[PDB]
Amino acid sequence: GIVEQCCTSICSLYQLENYCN
Amino acid sequence: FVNQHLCGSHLVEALYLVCGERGFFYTPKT
Ligand SMILES: [Zn+2]
């Protein structure tokens, strides 16, 4: 999920947009 | 875009800004 991916490790802008509606 | 670990409220504001009018879903349940 998002924490593992963007908090626990680092997220590119693209990886963040996967969480938009 | 910043290249860092984004946690807690910092993750949510990142989402807010990136998603704009689309909105987003925050489900931290791991
Ligand atoms: Zn802080």
UniProtKB/Swiss-Prot annotation, chain B:
Known outcome of mutating H10D: In HPRI; Providence
Substitution effect: F24S: In HPRI; Los-Angeles
Protein name: Insulin B chain
Species name: Homo sapiens
Shown stretch of the complete protein: 25 to 54 of 110
